[PDB]
Symmetry: D2
Subunit: 422 residues, 4 copies
């Protein structure tokens, strides 16, 4: 029964053609949904009660579009998101962090606009986790956004939105200085011929997967759901293909900001992503990611590939990793393991931000500390296991891979352990 | 010899990549497509696309197959649609540069446990009006195909049966259905209501993969450019859906309400043409050809053996085209199954085969009507030269290009066994 | 180039030109062959063990010391010739020569003693002389038995029974020497600790032109099973009378290593020949060249794809450790082992990194020479009061011996493999350490 | 049949990995294909008798090597006469006649920097006596090859120059030497004294790999069966060395003292024949063909394009043979470079080309002696029929087998462009 579920007959195929031939509509997904969902907040999804339903439906990142609305309007949206998120904090083993992303208005006819400088300052003051920077055309645009965030915004992730020909052509220099990329298909589809957007999307997703940096697919993914309860055949196909392409995140704009079915749009992205993730041809994907990833003498990078290799060898249910900044979980995510990456962190901001990396399930650790560092490490690993059991990730008898470091503080991950559950 | 400009166009840097990941990383929006569009476009005929003048614009935009939906309209209405399509097609007979055959496909209303009374009458109408293809609705098992085949009377055994897979049973019994069908249509409208909407992409990719493995045509259908029924431009999901159906391996893509009742039928055809050309250049031929070669069983049929040798030869020299002589279309279909980058120019004396080969990706039919030569070798040479002269006129070929030529050792269908490399003079 | 650019800048272009690294990084086997370079010098310690047959030309303590220095790892006693008294003296001389280097524990080299049986002769199974010789082996503490003319699984059960309850730790390497042994190979390998491709008799029992097929098949199946395989007989035959081998002989040794042999053997070349030390030196020189020429990129991918999925933590840790070693060009993998099993599971994935096995068992230290790339370090210190401290001391002993022997340098990355509790069977940890 | 797929290591040939290919090798799986790696036997006192030479031809000798390091011109002229007498003694049966090449192996430069005066005289003797190949000793750079070519003069333009790599400089300048040579010999005797003995296998495998990539012949030479100079059976290392040279990709294997001065010249030829046949069946064609195809550059030469199409077609149908018509041997060489499992039966009127194609693995030359038919197409057909009849007599072909036939569009060398699938009747 285990080998008939989650497209495992198609996963064992010797060629990609045979993998496609073996895909089965009766093979049910079992793994937790890996691709994060970004939902845009607006009049249709601003109330605390509506936000609670969206969190239950699968929303991982809340997007605030600063192209519309005042600072007062967005501050109320942030407060409502935080109230809805904290309403589930009573159960620490099941609590779900939700990131807050600020999407800038952009340069307009201008580099960094004066309104963007004020909006970025607002983001820092309100503790946003991510900035989706509009119309990034070159590396200096990213440096300007970084400078506008100031010293208090050093920890905020900058996701550069590629929306025109110049951004596509200067992609490599933009990716090098950014934390990640958004394929902003709305403007991109007006700036370049509509029939070429898929080439830009597939190229950017491939390059981000090679670099090990998050990539978001955005705009008109479930467009018809703004007025209809069910999407078109092209829309379900688009969501599935963005996941198959390698997108870390998928996004909803008008579907959740102003549409009549915001919760149903989130539920639809969740259902499609789970089916598409099981249909990923890991046999070729892992080999190519492993071959293309450069040789490294960084112990976190070395431990990450050893852990992902070990996970595939034993069909590990999960890789439990301790992380301060999210980096150790990001380096595991870049190899696209089938095993869920359960990231245990004390940083509330890192827990929200790791939603940018596919297959990372953040667990915010709020248990009392242990006096002995080694006991504190062991307790965080046990917390990951207990949360895993509660959420359905793990069962007694499963094997897990545990990734830890030799001393406290970020940057010292160097250990991988094989553990039998209970 | 060819120049650096040649190797920068049609995604050739991405085509030479050693891995699929590197292939994706090398896709370039500035690398322009050069080859003729190989995935056929099926447009549904209705009130928005029925007039002769509107049909001429749709043919110019790229329509290759006209679909008649027998779920609506009388026999009289459909006979007039057929007459209008034929009048629009024949209006280009005076110019070899613009003349193109257009297939006529009859899409049945559907079943009841099996073949309905209305379907028997509509299939008889198809035979009497000389339709080329039948898109059989709600095919659930092999016996449904046998019933459609039987209903094609004594006169319509040459009509192609494309089985529409629209429910759970059709997906589960896919192998037995494909074995007896000429091809398949992934009918996503009903399929997306019969099975969970989030599983349709799995059924689509599986069926396209199995049809590619079997060497039989597969059509992707329904809601591909849906918003274009009322809007002049499609959504980002719609352009993505068209491109991904071509990348998946679909031989044909379809338009339903977009051309039958929408406000922008011609623009919807133009959009599918533009996307298909971009997607065809982005196909990763290096792995695709290797996997088609490895999965296809060994064969002692000379047509199959010649076809793989010809496709291999075409890749070796970047051949502009593979010119094949065919009476039934079968030799061109066996070349098409290996997905060559070179256009397959099929020279035939059969008007029906010329229309039907639009079902196979990359086949460009040329109907030949010269009186037969007394010396057979001279008749063959005249047809090969006709494919070369049509290719030069249409922009496929230039003097100095290499072409692969596929013929047989004697007249009559079934003897293809020769592949030749010719330098265009 | 992008996959090696940062490490080329850090380690230097000279590092990536040595040990056939351009050939090892090639994308195809054809390109791997085209990139093999006679100017690319081997740097790693020799990983394929050398078995030398003891006889009149290699029996003295002084001669044995030179053979140990030349590279002999396993001493073979051929019980087809000589009395029990003769073989007991050979064993005593080997042990005296080996223990002459024991003064320095950070550099000491263990040497295994293998007993090669006379065989069944015209009989159907275990002969009476073999029963007596196997009892002699147990009484004299031999490490390995090379069982002659093994034709079926019941032959190895008979050898095991003849070793008795005191010889349970002795490794049984079945010699395949005839058509029946080749045909029943799978059942024989299943119950054996390893195999010897005994080409002398095999080349008379089956057509001489088919021996290479049997050799390559048996080596491939042993590599797939993760069990040691020995290539034997006439490898450097002409060196029995000449100081230099023929072109076919050097080719044969190189190809046995490339095929995947864990051990290579010398028979008449060391037992009665005029150049025993030179024959060992020649096998050592060829094996280091051939080990560097192994196409690890495809070999590791195929060993990974063919090896079944496993829920054994030692197996899971071993593949993760070998993967980690390749990622950073690790100089070595240091493993703690009681029986040798954790080092054997690392060896089956054919890492380029040396497997430094720290053990308290003198017998396991001798026996691990059967597994390619395992360098045994015998730890003699009494246990620390705290088990975690005792484990740490053994890892540090491996690092310090590694630095002393030239295996490790300051700045190198090393992979360390340990377990969660004392006793054999609990290896489950892989650590990445930077050498200071 | 199941029996067909159990022979010639076909279970190991279908394996998905090289490791599984090795695990499936079976000593009971008998070779069926004709031995494709040519055997070069050195002529000396043990192999100069006309009667002894007839036995060596029957045992499998394809090329006779004359070592000009020993003996006068008078001695070599008598060796040539004896070889030709033994070869022509079988010319009364044209369907089974076996051509045998004559190669002149030069003394070398000695202490000099380039072409010696004795080599100039010996090369002129070779041209005057019609030798087919020159094995040029101690080639260290491209200018050494140009000097040999100049010494052969205008009458020796058709002689093949195989450069012997025997020292460090020759290995380091390998690429420039191969570029101007017809092929290479890995001369392991001197190479094993010029560089460390333990490094010779690296130089051998590298040179064979580079020659296979370039599509040029490579010979493995010296001490392959050394002990057979005095003993009736070789050592285990010697049989292994011969098998591994064939597995490495050598087009030819050589015997020196084993045939020139030993007591078992015929048995040494028989031993190389037996081992080569076993090793050829053990070649992992699945990865070999894929890598040769991928590494071979794109080409606009019709002979090159036809060759890859023909080899691909042969593998698709398990063709028993590829029958090719050739004037210079070039069309057969281009088929050989793709290492087909099918025998390449080369039909030629050039006695010199028939002898020289023995340098290319898997090429079986057939010398056609009939004068030309008045109708060129009939002359082509008669030569193809001669190939089929010779193939049936020699055991290459049987009724029911499929063959690939490679011909050209006009008479004369350089115009191969046609591949045809033929059923043997
Ligand atoms: O050669 S193919 O085009 N690709 C084969 C291929 C695919 C997935 C992976 C896994 C992976 C690796 C790296 C990645 O970065 C990544 O995102 C994913 C590896 C190789 C190909 C070969 C066929 O035989 C065939 O029938 C259809 C297609 C085909 C069609 C449509 C598609 O959209 C498509 O994916 C492929
Ligand atoms: O990584 S390997 O070396 N395989 C390389 C390989 C690949 C394809 C082909 C087909 C071919 C032939 C010649 C060609 O020139 C060419 O392009 C292609 C053959 C070998 C290898 C992997 C294993 O899993 C294993 O157990 C053993 C070995 C191994 C050992 C000794 C050898 O002498 C050896 O040949 C390989
Ligand atoms: O992923 P990051 O940010 O590098 O954090 C990993 C770090 O977490 C740990 O596992 C635990 O560290 P703390 O005890 O400080 O939380 C360290 O050993 C390791 O260096
Ligand atoms: O694709 P099909 O229907 O088998 O037709 C291919 C046939 O066409 C030819 O090339 C030409 O035949 P005709 O002259 O009869 O048209 C035959 O030699 C070959 O058998
Ligand atoms: O390779 P083996 O025989 O399984 O030994 C590995 C064992 O060695 C250890 O690393 C150390 O064990 P000891 O302290 O008993 O020597 C164990 O944790 C592990 O189980
Ligand atoms: O291999 P080569 O030397 O190029 O010879 C191939 C030539 O042989 C032929 O098949 C027959 O030519 P001839 O009739 O002159 O022998 C030509 O059509 C072709 O050009
Ligand atoms: O700005 C965006 O998100 C877009 O244009 O898609
Ligand atoms: O009938 C159709 O075309 C459908 O249901 O998609
Ligand atoms: O017994 C042996 O060692 C042999 O036959 O090779
Ligand atoms: O000259 C030769 O043949 C040699 O040195 O091997
Ligand atoms: K915005
Ligand atoms: K219908
Ligand atoms: K013995
Ligand atoms: K000479
Ligand atoms: Mg925008
Ligand atoms: Mg329908
Ligand atoms: Mg023996
Ligand atoms: Mg020499």
């Amino acid at each position: 029964a285990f080998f008939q579920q989650q497209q495992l007959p198609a996963a064992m195929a010797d060629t990609f053609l045979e993998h496609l031939c073996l895909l089965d509509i009766d093979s049910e997904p079992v793994a937790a949904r890996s691709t994060s969902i970004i939902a845009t907040i607006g009049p249709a999804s601003r109330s605390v009660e509506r936000l609670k339903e969206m969190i239950k439906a699968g929303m991982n990142i809340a997007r605030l579009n600063f192209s519309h609305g005042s600072h007062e309007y967005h501050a109320e949206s942030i407060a409502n998101v935080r109230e809805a998120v904290e309403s589930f904090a009573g159960s620490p083993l099941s609590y779900r962090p939700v990131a807050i992303a600020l999407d800038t208005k952009g340069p307009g006819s201008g580099g960094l606009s004066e309104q963007d400088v004020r909006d970025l300052r607002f983001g820092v003051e309100h503790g946003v986790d991510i900035v989706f920077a509009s119309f990034v055309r070159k590396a200096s645009d990213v440096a300007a956004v970084r400078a506008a965030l100031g010293p208090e915004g050093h920890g905020i992730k900058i996701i550069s939105k590629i929306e025109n020909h110049e951004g596509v052509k200067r992609f490599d220099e933009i990716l090098e200085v950014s934390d990640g990329i958004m394929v902003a298909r709305g403007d991109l589809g007006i700036e370049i011929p509509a029939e070429k957007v898929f080439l830009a999307q597939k190229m950017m997703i491939g390059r981000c997967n090679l670099a090990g940096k998050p990539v978001v697919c955005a705009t008109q993914m479930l467009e018809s759901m703004i007025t209809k309860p069910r999407p078109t055949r092209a829309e379900t196909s688009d969501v599935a293909n963005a996941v198959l392409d390698g997108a870390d995140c998928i996004m909803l704009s008008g579907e959740t900001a102003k549409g009549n079915f915001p919760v149903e749009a989130v539920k639809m992205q969740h259902a499609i992503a789970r089916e598409a993730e099981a249909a990923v041809y890991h046999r070729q994907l892992f080999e190519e990611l492993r071959r293309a990833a450069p040789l490294s003498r960084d112990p976190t990078e070395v431990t990450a590939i050893g852990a992902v290799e070990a996970a595939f060898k034993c069909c590990a249910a999960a890789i439990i990793v301790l992380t301060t900044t999210g980096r150790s979980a990001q380096l595991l995510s870049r190899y696209r393991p089938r095993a869920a990456v359960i990231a245990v962190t004390r940083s509330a901001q890192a827990a929200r931000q790791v939603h940018l990396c596919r297959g990372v399930f953040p667990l915010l650790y709020r248990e009392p500390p242990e006096a002995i560092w080694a006991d504190d490490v062991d307790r965080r690993v046990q917390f990951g296991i207990e949360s895993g059991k509660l959420r359905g990730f793990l069962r007694v008898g499963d094997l897990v891979i545990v990734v830890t470091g030799w001393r406290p503080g970020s940057g010292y991950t160097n250990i991988m352990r094989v553990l039998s559950i209970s």
